[PDB]
Amino acid sequence: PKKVLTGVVVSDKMQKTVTVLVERQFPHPLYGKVIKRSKKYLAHDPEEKYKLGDVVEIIESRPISKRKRFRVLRLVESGRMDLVEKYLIRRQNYESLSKR
Amino acid sequence: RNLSALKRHRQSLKRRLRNKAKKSAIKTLSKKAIQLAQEGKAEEALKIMRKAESLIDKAAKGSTLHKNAAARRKSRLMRKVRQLLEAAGAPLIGGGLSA
Amino acid sequence: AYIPGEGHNLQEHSVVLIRGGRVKDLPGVRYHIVRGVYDAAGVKDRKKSRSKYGTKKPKEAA
Amino acid sequence: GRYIGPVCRLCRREGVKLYLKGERCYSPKCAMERRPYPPGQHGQKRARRPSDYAVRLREKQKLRRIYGISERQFRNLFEEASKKKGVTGSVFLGLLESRLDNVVYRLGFAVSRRQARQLVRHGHITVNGRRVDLPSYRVRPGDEIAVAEKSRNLELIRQNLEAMKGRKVGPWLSLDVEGMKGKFLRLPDREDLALPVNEQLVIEFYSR
Amino acid sequence: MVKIRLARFGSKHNPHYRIVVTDARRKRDGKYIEKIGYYDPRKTTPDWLKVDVERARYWLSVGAQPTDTARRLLRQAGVFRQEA
RNA sequence: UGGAGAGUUUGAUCCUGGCUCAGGGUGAACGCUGGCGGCGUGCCUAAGACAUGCAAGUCGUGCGGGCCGCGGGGUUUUACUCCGUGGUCAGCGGCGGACGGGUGAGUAACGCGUGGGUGACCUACCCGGAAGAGGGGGACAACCCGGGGAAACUCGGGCUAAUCCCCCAUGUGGACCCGCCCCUUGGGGUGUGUCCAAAGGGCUUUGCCCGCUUCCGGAUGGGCCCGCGUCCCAUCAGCUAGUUGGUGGGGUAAUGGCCCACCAAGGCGACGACGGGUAGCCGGUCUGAGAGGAUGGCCGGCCACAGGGGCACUGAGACACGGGCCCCACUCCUACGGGAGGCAGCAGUUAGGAAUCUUCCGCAAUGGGCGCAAGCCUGACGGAGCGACGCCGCUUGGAGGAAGAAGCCCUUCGGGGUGUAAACUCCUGAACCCGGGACGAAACCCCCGACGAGGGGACUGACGGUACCGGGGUAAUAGCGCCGGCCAACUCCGUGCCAGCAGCCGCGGUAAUACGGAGGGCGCGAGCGUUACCCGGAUUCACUGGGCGUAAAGGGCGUGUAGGCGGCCUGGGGCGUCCCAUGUGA
Ligand SMILES: [Mg+2]
Ligand SMILES: [Mg+2]
Ligand SMILES: [Mg+2]
Ligand SMILES: [Mg+2]
Ligand SMILES: [Mg+2]
Ligand SMILES: [Mg+2]
Ligand SMILES: [Mg+2]
Ligand SMILES: [Mg+2]
Ligand SMILES: [Mg+2]
Ligand SMILES: [Mg+2]
Ligand SMILES: [Mg+2]
Ligand SMILES: [Mg+2]
Ligand SMILES: [Mg+2]
Ligand SMILES: [Mg+2]
Ligand SMILES: [Mg+2]
Ligand SMILES: [Mg+2]
Ligand SMILES: [Mg+2]
Ligand SMILES: [Mg+2]
Ligand SMILES: [Mg+2]
Ligand SMILES: [Mg+2]
Ligand SMILES: [Mg+2]
Ligand SMILES: [Mg+2]
Ligand SMILES: [Mg+2]
Ligand SMILES: [Mg+2]
Ligand SMILES: [Mg+2]
Ligand SMILES: [Mg+2]
Ligand SMILES: [Mg+2]
Ligand SMILES: [Mg+2]
Ligand SMILES: [Mg+2]
Ligand SMILES: [Mg+2]
Ligand SMILES: [Mg+2]
Ligand SMILES: [Mg+2]
Ligand SMILES: [Mg+2]
Ligand SMILES: [Mg+2]
Ligand SMILES: [Mg+2]
Ligand SMILES: [Mg+2]
Ligand SMILES: [Mg+2]
Ligand SMILES: [Mg+2]
Ligand SMILES: [Mg+2]
Ligand SMILES: [Mg+2]
Ligand SMILES: [Mg+2]
Ligand SMILES: [Mg+2]
Ligand SMILES: [Mg+2]
Ligand SMILES: [Mg+2]
Ligand SMILES: [Mg+2]
Ligand SMILES: [Mg+2]
Ligand SMILES: [Mg+2]
Ligand SMILES: [Mg+2]
Ligand SMILES: [Mg+2]
Ligand SMILES: [Mg+2]
Ligand SMILES: [Mg+2]
Ligand SMILES: [Mg+2]
Ligand SMILES: [Mg+2]
Ligand SMILES: [Mg+2]
Ligand SMILES: [Mg+2]
Ligand SMILES: [Mg+2]
Ligand SMILES: [Mg+2]
Ligand SMILES: [Mg+2]
Ligand SMILES: [Mg+2]
Ligand SMILES: [Mg+2]
Ligand SMILES: [Mg+2]
Ligand SMILES: [Mg+2]
Ligand SMILES: [Mg+2]
Ligand SMILES: [Mg+2]
Ligand SMILES: [Mg+2]
Ligand SMILES: [Mg+2]
Ligand SMILES: [Mg+2]
Ligand SMILES: [Mg+2]
Ligand SMILES: [Mg+2]
Ligand SMILES: [Mg+2]
Ligand SMILES: [Mg+2]
Ligand SMILES: [Mg+2]
Ligand SMILES: [Mg+2]
Ligand SMILES: [Mg+2]
Ligand SMILES: [Mg+2]
Ligand SMILES: [Mg+2]
Ligand SMILES: [Mg+2]
Ligand SMILES: [Mg+2]
Ligand SMILES: [Mg+2]
Ligand SMILES: [Mg+2]
Ligand SMILES: [Mg+2]
Ligand SMILES: [Mg+2]
Ligand SMILES: [Mg+2]
Ligand SMILES: [Mg+2]
Ligand SMILES: [Mg+2]
Ligand SMILES: [Mg+2]
Ligand SMILES: [Mg+2]
Ligand SMILES: [Mg+2]
Ligand SMILES: [Mg+2]
Ligand SMILES: [Mg+2]
Ligand SMILES: [Mg+2]
Ligand SMILES: [Mg+2]
Ligand SMILES: [Mg+2]
Ligand SMILES: [Mg+2]
Ligand SMILES: [Mg+2]
Ligand SMILES: [Mg+2]
Ligand SMILES: [Mg+2]
Ligand SMILES: [Mg+2]
Ligand SMILES: [Mg+2]
Ligand SMILES: [Mg+2]
Ligand SMILES: [Mg+2]
Ligand SMILES: [Mg+2]
Ligand SMILES: [Mg+2]
Ligand SMILES: [Mg+2]
Ligand SMILES: [Zn+2]
C-alpha cells in the first residue's frame, strides 16, 4: 500500500509547497529505550490552503519534483503552533553551537 | 583480426541516416502547422497538421519513433494548434480534429 | 632485525627475509630473521630445533 | 599413517594392560608383569602428583591408544558425538566400536586391532557381501561381517576363529564361528563393555 | 524465452540435475523461477526422477519451452500423453 | 542444551589494573620434511604493461553473383549455358552480438538489504485470443570499368536481387485533439476528425509447414519512485545558484529541477548537514554460552567498471569488453610514403610480491545462439593438468619373539634404560604385471500413427581402457615440534652473564631438568612448526554484563536552553506495547 504518514507543517515559503515534520517512536535495537526520530518532507499543496501548525497527513505519491514526492491527505487538527515552537528553537539554537 | 559482425555497425549507419532524415522532416514539417495555426491560416495549417500526424504515426513502422512517443508528439501537437487557432483563427477543417 | 642462533653469514649488501616477533632484551627491535633464505644461511651443525635456524636434516651414519 | 613401533611400552605408560598384542599383551604381560612401570631412563623413579590436566591427558591417550587411532579421525568422532544430545560420553564409545577394524577384533577374526586393520585393508573382510577395505567404515544394526572366498581359507583365519570357541561375544554381537559370519545387533551402552577409561575425564579434556 | 532445462548439481563425475523454469538468459545453475523435480542420469536411486505435472503443464499453458533433452524426460515422464 | 580458566606488581595479604598463554578460524605464506587417492581451492600485490592462440556466430526453407564441382541442356572451337544438386567463399538481407565470461577500481549513495508504490512505463524471441496479408515504384553491394598505396586499402564510373527500401489501397484494430459517461493522478468506454499497417521462401504441393502484418490479453525480464536499515573523524559546524518551490516548455517507455526559460527565496544541518578518510552491498562466513564481535574470498542475487575520460549511433533492450567517433597516455608495423592496438575473457609472458596454476581435451554430456532440420560455433560448460593450500580417506605391515643381543645412554659399577623394539620365523601382502571394462547416452533425427499421442528403430564419450571386476603379485616414505613454570615429558656432558633461549615470568657467574649435543620421554603424523590476521578467553566499552572518597574517573560553583524523566482517580483515542490470522523472508 501507498505509505501514509502524520506530521505537522513548519514551512510554506514555497509557491505551492509546504514542509512537514514527522516523528516516529521505536525501541533502540541495542538499548531498547523508546526513542523518537524526525524527517522533514516536502508536501505538495496545489491549492495552498494549509498553513503552519497544521497537524496533517501525507501519502506516498508519484514524483512531483526532485525532493518532492509527497502529496497532502487531510487535516488532523490545525492551530498547533506549539509544536512549531520547539522545532523553531532547535534551528534557532544551532547558531550557538558554531565552532566559532 | 576481427569479426564480420562489424556489419551491424556498417548497417546501423543506414538505419541512422535513414530515420535521421525521416526525423529532420517531422521537425521542420511540424513547424509549418505551428507557424500557420499561430497566424490564422487554419485551412492550410490543418492539412500540414494531418500530414505531421502522418509522418509521426507513419514513423511507428520501424525503430525510429515508437511507444507513446508519436502519442506524446501529437498530444502536444494537435493540442497546441487548437489553442493557437482558438485566438481568432476560427476553425476551418477538422480534418484531424474531433472537435 | 634479530639474527637467531650461533653464527651467521650476513654482510652489508645481504638479502634477507623478515619474520616478526620481538626480542625484549633488545629494546627497539621487533622483528626476527628467517634462516636459510636468500643470503641468510641456516646455522651449521644444528641438530635440535631445525625448523627454525633453517638447517636441513644431516646424514646419520654414512 | 597410523602408529607403528613399540606398543608394550604404551601398555605400561598408562600403567594398565590394554591387550594391543595378540598373545603377549595377553600372555604373562604387555611386557609389564615383568616391568609394570613407565618406559624411559626414568622408570624406577617415584612420580609427581599428576595435575588435573595430565590426568585427563593420560586418561585420553589411554582410550585413543586402545583403538589405535590417529588424533585426526579420533577427535572428529568426539565432536560428532558431542554434537548429538543425550550423554555424548556414552554415545562416543558407540561410534568407536562401530568401526570395521573394531568389529573384526571383537568377532575374533583377529586377535589385535592392528591385525584387524591389515585384514580389512588387504580386502579379506566382507560386509553384507561387499569388499570393504576401509577400517574407517562405520557399521549399523544387522550388518553382516564375514570373510571373502579368496580368503575363507588361509591358515591364519581358521586359527583365529577356532580360538573363538571357548570364548563369548559381546551382548551386542553374534558370531557364526563355523560359518565365518557375524552380526552387529545394537549399539553397546557404557554398561555393555567395562574399561579402565573414565569417559567423563575425556569429555573434560576436550573442553580445554 | 522462458525455458525448462537441466541444472548440474551434486559433484564432479556425479550429476544430479535439477529440472526448473527460468529465463534463457540466466546461467544454467542460476536463480530459477520455480523448481519442478530432478533426475539422475546414473540411475543410482529409486527416485532418479520426479515431476509435478499439475505445475509443469501450467508453464506450458503460459508458453514455456523445454530443451531437446529436457523433452525426452518430460515426454518419457508421462506429461505429453494428450489422452481422451 | 549452553558458560573452566592460568602466568606476571609484595617479604607475604586482599584489591584494582595492564601485559601474556592454552582455543577455534584463513584464498595464506615461510622453515624442516614429504608416499597415495578423492573432493574442494589457488594474483589478496600493479583495475601496472602484454607477444601468440582461442573465447559468437548462424540460416541456400530471404537474393544475386564466385569458382568449384557435379549427373548432365543443346551445338558456327577447348566446351557451351542449360539444369538440379550442391559445395560453397564473399556480398545483400534476417537473428544473436545488451545473454554467457572476468574484475572490485569507483561508489557512504535509493548502490544494497527488507517491505511497498507506478491512475507515471517499456519488454524482442515464447503462449493465447480477433483480424489481415490488394496492387504499384525504387536504391546499394556483388559484378564490369577507373585512380591512389608498401600496407591498411581507398575513392571513383555504371548495372542488378529480393523477407532490403518507397508509395497507394485496406482497415478487424491501434494512435491523438475535444465533448460525454464511469472510474477517478493520463484507468476503461463512448461519439465525432484526422493518421497508421504487411513478406515472401520451401515442399512427401494443391494442401500443410517455415514466416509477414495490427490489436487485446499471458508470461518473463526491466526502468523510475517511496518507508525503514547501511562504517570512521565535530581535531570536519555550518552547506547550497538549478541551489529549494513555482509556471510553461524541451526530454524519455514515462514521473522528476532531468534539461531550459521566467516567477518567488527558498531548500539542508548537533536526530550531525557540508567536508576528509575507508569500503562494492546482501545470502552468507568465522568466532562466541549468549548477545555480540569480525568478515564479504570460492558458490548465488544486486551494483559498477571493460586502458583514462567524453559522446552518441543501432536497437525491443547498450551509451555496448572481444561495436563506432574524439582527446590523452602507452605501445607495435612500416618499402616510414603511413597505419595499428586495448586479457578486469581462457591459458601464457612480464613487473610488483612472503605468495597463488596448463600457452591441456572435448563439444560426449548440460546450457546458449542461429536453423525446417541435419547441422554449426560455444576457453559457458564437461573434464583432464600443476600446487600437502584445505578437508577426507590410505599406506610404509601383522603374529610370534629374550630375563630381554649388539650399540648408545646413564650408574652408588651391584645395576637401570632404549626394549618386543630389532633380529629372527611364519602370515597377508598396497603398489606393479595380464585380461576384462564401464554408469555417465538419451533424445534431436527415422519408420508406423497426421510430423499429435503412442510404439518401434538408429546415432553419438571428451574424461580414457579411466573408475571398478578377476588373478597374478613384492614387507614396501617418516617426518616436526616440545620436555624450567603456565604445560605432557629428565638425565649426562659441554659451556661459564661467553656462545645463546625467550609468549609472559625469566634462564647462562665451573655442578644449568631453561644455552649447545647426546640418551631418554611427552605431543602429533604426511605432515609438524613459525609468522600474520579475525573471535574467544577480555566481564578489558560491561545492552545481556563494570566503574568514579583513597586504585583511572563528580564538571570549581550556580542559573538555564534543547533533551531525557515524572505524582492520585475517571473517560475518548489504541501511537508504543500484546495476541491471532495472512503474505514475504528463493
Ligand atoms: Mg510493421
Ligand atoms: Mg532508438
Ligand atoms: Mg546433549
Ligand atoms: Mg572448549
Ligand atoms: Mg537477466
Ligand atoms: Mg522426445
Ligand atoms: Mg591471574
Ligand atoms: Mg608496587
Ligand atoms: Mg618477589
Ligand atoms: Mg585485568
Ligand atoms: Mg592461535
Ligand atoms: Mg580479502
Ligand atoms: Mg596483474
Ligand atoms: Mg603502478
Ligand atoms: Mg545444407
Ligand atoms: Mg556483455
Ligand atoms: Mg554477466
Ligand atoms: Mg580469474
Ligand atoms: Mg572463476
Ligand atoms: Mg564521503
Ligand atoms: Mg557524510
Ligand atoms: Mg584499379
Ligand atoms: Mg553507383
Ligand atoms: Mg525490380
Ligand atoms: Mg496508406
Ligand atoms: Mg480516460
Ligand atoms: Mg503491400
Ligand atoms: Mg530456394
Ligand atoms: Mg539494469
Ligand atoms: Mg515540466
Ligand atoms: Mg533508451
Ligand atoms: Mg520537470
Ligand atoms: Mg512537467
Ligand atoms: Mg532557469
Ligand atoms: Mg553540541
Ligand atoms: Mg534525523
Ligand atoms: Mg557523530
Ligand atoms: Mg571522500
Ligand atoms: Mg574500494
Ligand atoms: Mg551480515
Ligand atoms: Mg556460518
Ligand atoms: Mg554457539
Ligand atoms: Mg549473530
Ligand atoms: Mg559490512
Ligand atoms: Mg578473486
Ligand atoms: Mg561472484
Ligand atoms: Mg590493464
Ligand atoms: Mg534487458
Ligand atoms: Mg560487447
Ligand atoms: Mg566501448
Ligand atoms: Mg555498461
Ligand atoms: Mg577482450
Ligand atoms: Mg592482442
Ligand atoms: Mg589470463
Ligand atoms: Mg598465470
Ligand atoms: Mg620478484
Ligand atoms: Mg583451474
Ligand atoms: Mg557442447
Ligand atoms: Mg546443445
Ligand atoms: Mg532446428
Ligand atoms: Mg570457433
Ligand atoms: Mg577449446
Ligand atoms: Mg571450468
Ligand atoms: Mg593430495
Ligand atoms: Mg609448505
Ligand atoms: Mg633391558
Ligand atoms: Mg639396550
Ligand atoms: Mg612386531
Ligand atoms: Mg604369497
Ligand atoms: Mg577390450
Ligand atoms: Mg546430435
Ligand atoms: Mg523411440
Ligand atoms: Mg527407441
Ligand atoms: Mg587394467
Ligand atoms: Mg588384485
Ligand atoms: Mg620390514
Ligand atoms: Mg608442542
Ligand atoms: Mg599446550
Ligand atoms: Mg610437567
Ligand atoms: Mg645472566
Ligand atoms: Mg651482571
Ligand atoms: Mg630451543
Ligand atoms: Mg655441568
Ligand atoms: Mg646456577
Ligand atoms: Mg625452554
Ligand atoms: Mg636442553
Ligand atoms: Mg628423546
Ligand atoms: Mg624425554
Ligand atoms: Mg600449519
Ligand atoms: Mg569456546
Ligand atoms: Mg550496562
Ligand atoms: Mg571496572
Ligand atoms: Mg555517585
Ligand atoms: Mg594518588
Ligand atoms: Mg584518584
Ligand atoms: Mg564538587
Ligand atoms: Mg555541575
Ligand atoms: Mg572550567
Ligand atoms: Mg554546574
Ligand atoms: Mg524542560
Ligand atoms: Mg514527557
Ligand atoms: Mg504518567
Ligand atoms: Mg488512555
Ligand atoms: Mg509470519
Ligand atoms: Zn603387552
mmCIF file of N, CA and C (backbone and C1' of nucleotides) in Angstrom, chain D residues 2-14 16-22 24-25 30-32 39 65 68 112 114, chain F residues 397-401 418-422:
data_model
loop_
_atom_site.group_PDB
_atom_site.id
_atom_site.type_symbol
_atom_site.label_atom_id
_atom_site.label_comp_id
_atom_site.label_asym_id
_atom_site.label_seq_id
_atom_site.Cartn_x
_atom_site.Cartn_y
_atom_site.Cartn_z
ATOM 1 N N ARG D 2 48.837 -44.498 10.504
ATOM 2 C CA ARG D 2 48.658 -44.988 11.872
ATOM 3 C C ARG D 2 49.984 -45.202 12.605
ATOM 4 N N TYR D 3 49.904 -45.489 13.902
ATOM 5 C CA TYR D 3 51.109 -45.699 14.701
ATOM 6 C C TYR D 3 51.831 -47.010 14.368
ATOM 7 N N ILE D 4 53.158 -46.984 14.456
ATOM 8 C CA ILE D 4 53.988 -48.160 14.204
ATOM 9 C C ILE D 4 55.197 -48.174 15.139
ATOM 10 N N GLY D 5 55.437 -49.315 15.779
ATOM 11 C CA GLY D 5 56.575 -49.458 16.668
ATOM 12 C C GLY D 5 56.159 -49.835 18.076
ATOM 13 N N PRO D 6 57.104 -49.746 19.029
ATOM 14 C CA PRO D 6 56.941 -50.108 20.444
ATOM 15 C C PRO D 6 55.550 -49.802 20.981
ATOM 16 N N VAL D 7 54.883 -50.837 21.482
ATOM 17 C CA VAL D 7 53.487 -50.751 21.884
ATOM 18 C C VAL D 7 53.306 -51.293 23.291
ATOM 19 N N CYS D 8 54.120 -52.285 23.649
ATOM 20 C CA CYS D 8 54.147 -52.797 25.012
ATOM 21 C C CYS D 8 54.582 -51.675 25.939
ATOM 22 N N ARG D 9 55.305 -50.710 25.379
ATOM 23 C CA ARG D 9 55.767 -49.562 26.143
ATOM 24 C C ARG D 9 54.592 -48.664 26.514
ATOM 25 N N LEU D 10 53.627 -48.563 25.608
ATOM 26 C CA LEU D 10 52.386 -47.867 25.906
ATOM 27 C C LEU D 10 51.609 -48.696 26.920
ATOM 28 N N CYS D 11 51.542 -50.013 26.679
ATOM 29 C CA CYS D 11 50.817 -50.929 27.563
ATOM 30 C C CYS D 11 51.156 -50.497 29.004
ATOM 31 N N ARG D 12 52.382 -50.004 29.213
ATOM 32 C CA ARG D 12 52.873 -49.681 30.561
ATOM 33 C C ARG D 12 53.133 -48.194 30.821
ATOM 34 N N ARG D 13 52.943 -47.361 29.803
ATOM 35 C CA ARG D 13 52.998 -45.918 30.008
ATOM 36 C C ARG D 13 51.751 -45.459 30.764
ATOM 37 N N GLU D 14 50.600 -46.025 30.410
ATOM 38 C CA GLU D 14 49.354 -45.701 31.102
ATOM 39 C C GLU D 14 49.231 -46.449 32.423
ATOM 40 N N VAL D 16 48.502 -49.818 32.668
ATOM 41 C CA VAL D 16 47.387 -50.750 32.545
ATOM 42 C C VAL D 16 47.486 -51.603 31.275
ATOM 43 N N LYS D 17 47.307 -52.909 31.460
ATOM 44 C CA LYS D 17 47.035 -53.850 30.381
ATOM 45 C C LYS D 17 46.048 -53.246 29.374
ATOM 46 N N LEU D 18 46.368 -53.281 28.087
ATOM 47 C CA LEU D 18 45.330 -52.946 27.118
ATOM 48 C C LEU D 18 45.266 -53.906 25.930
ATOM 49 N N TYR D 19 46.032 -54.990 26.006
ATOM 50 C CA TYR D 19 45.944 -56.088 25.038
ATOM 51 C C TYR D 19 45.980 -55.641 23.573
ATOM 52 N N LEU D 20 46.955 -54.796 23.254
ATOM 53 C CA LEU D 20 47.200 -54.384 21.878
ATOM 54 C C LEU D 20 47.986 -55.481 21.131
ATOM 55 N N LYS D 21 48.702 -56.317 21.887
ATOM 56 C CA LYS D 21 49.333 -57.516 21.335
ATOM 57 C C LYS D 21 48.305 -58.648 21.267
ATOM 58 N N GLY D 22 48.618 -59.691 20.504
ATOM 59 C CA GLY D 22 47.780 -60.876 20.464
ATOM 60 C C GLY D 22 47.922 -61.715 21.723
ATOM 61 N N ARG D 24 50.991 -62.058 23.579
ATOM 62 C CA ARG D 24 51.849 -61.339 24.536
ATOM 63 C C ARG D 24 51.137 -60.299 25.431
ATOM 64 N N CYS D 25 50.715 -59.158 24.874
ATOM 65 C CA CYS D 25 49.933 -58.162 25.618
ATOM 66 C C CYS D 25 48.778 -58.852 26.323
ATOM 67 N N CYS D 30 51.858 -57.282 28.996
ATOM 68 C CA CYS D 30 52.201 -56.381 27.891
ATOM 69 C C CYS D 30 53.624 -55.954 28.176
ATOM 70 N N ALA D 31 54.518 -56.895 28.507
ATOM 71 C CA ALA D 31 55.890 -56.574 28.989
ATOM 72 C C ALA D 31 55.917 -55.919 30.382
ATOM 73 N N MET D 32 54.916 -56.222 31.201
ATOM 74 C CA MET D 32 54.619 -55.426 32.395
ATOM 75 C C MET D 32 54.618 -56.282 33.656
ATOM 76 N N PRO D 39 58.096 -46.401 30.689
ATOM 77 C CA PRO D 39 59.315 -46.554 29.888
ATOM 78 C C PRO D 39 60.328 -45.447 30.170
ATOM 79 N N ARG D 65 44.727 -44.709 22.324
ATOM 80 C CA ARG D 65 45.769 -45.713 22.124
ATOM 81 C C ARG D 65 45.188 -47.130 22.126
ATOM 82 N N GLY D 68 43.849 -47.649 18.840
ATOM 83 C CA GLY D 68 44.970 -47.340 17.964
ATOM 84 C C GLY D 68 44.579 -46.480 16.782
ATOM 85 N N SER D 112 44.427 -58.892 17.530
ATOM 86 C CA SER D 112 44.718 -57.489 17.827
ATOM 87 C C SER D 112 44.007 -56.540 16.863
ATOM 88 N N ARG D 114 45.419 -53.967 15.503
ATOM 89 C CA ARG D 114 46.404 -53.719 14.448
ATOM 90 C C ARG D 114 46.472 -54.864 13.433
ATOM 91 P P G F 397 56.740 -51.020 8.165
ATOM 92 O "O5'" G F 397 55.501 -51.837 8.760
ATOM 93 C "C5'" G F 397 54.278 -51.186 9.083
ATOM 94 C "C4'" G F 397 53.081 -52.060 8.783
ATOM 95 C "C3'" G F 397 52.797 -53.181 9.773
ATOM 96 O "O3'" G F 397 52.113 -52.740 10.933
ATOM 97 C "C1'" G F 397 52.690 -54.035 7.577
ATOM 98 P P G F 398 52.390 -53.449 12.350
ATOM 99 O "O5'" G F 398 51.687 -54.871 12.181
ATOM 100 C "C5'" G F 398 50.268 -54.998 12.203
ATOM 101 C "C4'" G F 398 49.839 -56.446 12.108
ATOM 102 C "C3'" G F 398 50.371 -57.373 13.193
ATOM 103 O "O3'" G F 398 49.617 -57.316 14.392
ATOM 104 C "C1'" G F 398 50.727 -58.364 11.085
ATOM 105 P P A F 399 50.325 -57.607 15.808
ATOM 106 O "O5'" A F 399 50.545 -59.184 15.769
ATOM 107 C "C5'" A F 399 49.458 -60.087 15.937
ATOM 108 C "C4'" A F 399 49.944 -61.514 15.995
ATOM 109 C "C3'" A F 399 51.063 -61.791 16.993
ATOM 110 O "O3'" A F 399 50.596 -61.990 18.318
ATOM 111 C "C1'" A F 399 51.655 -62.697 14.902
ATOM 112 P P G F 400 51.578 -61.730 19.568
ATOM 113 O "O5'" G F 400 52.685 -62.858 19.391
ATOM 114 C "C5'" G F 400 52.341 -64.237 19.419
ATOM 115 C "C4'" G F 400 53.495 -65.096 18.967
ATOM 116 C "C3'" G F 400 54.796 -64.915 19.739
ATOM 117 O "O3'" G F 400 54.840 -65.670 20.940
ATOM 118 C "C1'" G F 400 55.237 -64.818 17.418
ATOM 119 P P G F 401 55.474 -65.031 22.274
ATOM 120 O "O5'" G F 401 56.975 -64.744 21.842
ATOM 121 C "C5'" G F 401 57.790 -65.779 21.319
ATOM 122 C "C4'" G F 401 59.092 -65.239 20.796
ATOM 123 C "C3'" G F 401 59.809 -64.246 21.696
ATOM 124 O "O3'" G F 401 60.537 -64.866 22.739
ATOM 125 C "C1'" G F 401 59.747 -63.398 19.501
ATOM 126 P P U F 418 62.814 -49.396 28.613
ATOM 127 O "O5'" U F 418 63.411 -48.869 27.238
ATOM 128 C "C5'" U F 418 63.038 -47.602 26.727
ATOM 129 C "C4'" U F 418 63.964 -47.161 25.627
ATOM 130 C "C3'" U F 418 63.872 -47.944 24.325
ATOM 131 O "O3'" U F 418 62.814 -47.490 23.495
ATOM 132 C "C1'" U F 418 66.140 -47.723 24.966
ATOM 133 P P G F 419 61.934 -48.523 22.623
ATOM 134 O "O5'" G F 419 61.816 -49.800 23.572
ATOM 135 C "C5'" G F 419 60.731 -50.721 23.427
ATOM 136 C "C4'" G F 419 60.953 -51.993 24.217
ATOM 137 C "C3'" G F 419 61.327 -51.793 25.688
ATOM 138 O "O3'" G F 419 60.817 -52.877 26.472
ATOM 139 C "C1'" G F 419 63.063 -52.941 24.583
ATOM 140 P P U F 420 59.352 -53.480 26.190
ATOM 141 O "O5'" U F 420 59.633 -54.544 25.044
ATOM 142 C "C5'" U F 420 58.609 -55.419 24.596
ATOM 143 C "C4'" U F 420 58.454 -55.366 23.100
ATOM 144 C "C3'" U F 420 57.266 -56.155 22.546
ATOM 145 O "O3'" U F 420 56.732 -55.481 21.403
ATOM 146 C "C1'" U F 420 59.254 -56.951 21.579
ATOM 147 P P A F 421 56.536 -53.884 21.417
ATOM 148 O "O5'" A F 421 57.867 -53.359 20.732
ATOM 149 C "C5'" A F 421 58.372 -53.981 19.567
ATOM 150 C "C4'" A F 421 59.532 -53.215 19.004
ATOM 151 C "C3'" A F 421 60.401 -53.962 18.013
ATOM 152 O "O3'" A F 421 59.836 -54.005 16.712
ATOM 153 C "C1'" A F 421 61.769 -52.840 19.577
ATOM 154 P P A F 422 59.971 -55.330 15.809
ATOM 155 O "O5'" A F 422 61.530 -55.385 15.509
ATOM 156 C "C5'" A F 422 62.206 -54.236 15.031
ATOM 157 C "C4'" A F 422 63.696 -54.443 14.987
ATOM 158 C "C3'" A F 422 64.174 -55.705 14.297
ATOM 159 O "O3'" A F 422 64.166 -55.598 12.884
ATOM 160 C "C1'" A F 422 65.340 -55.426 16.331
#
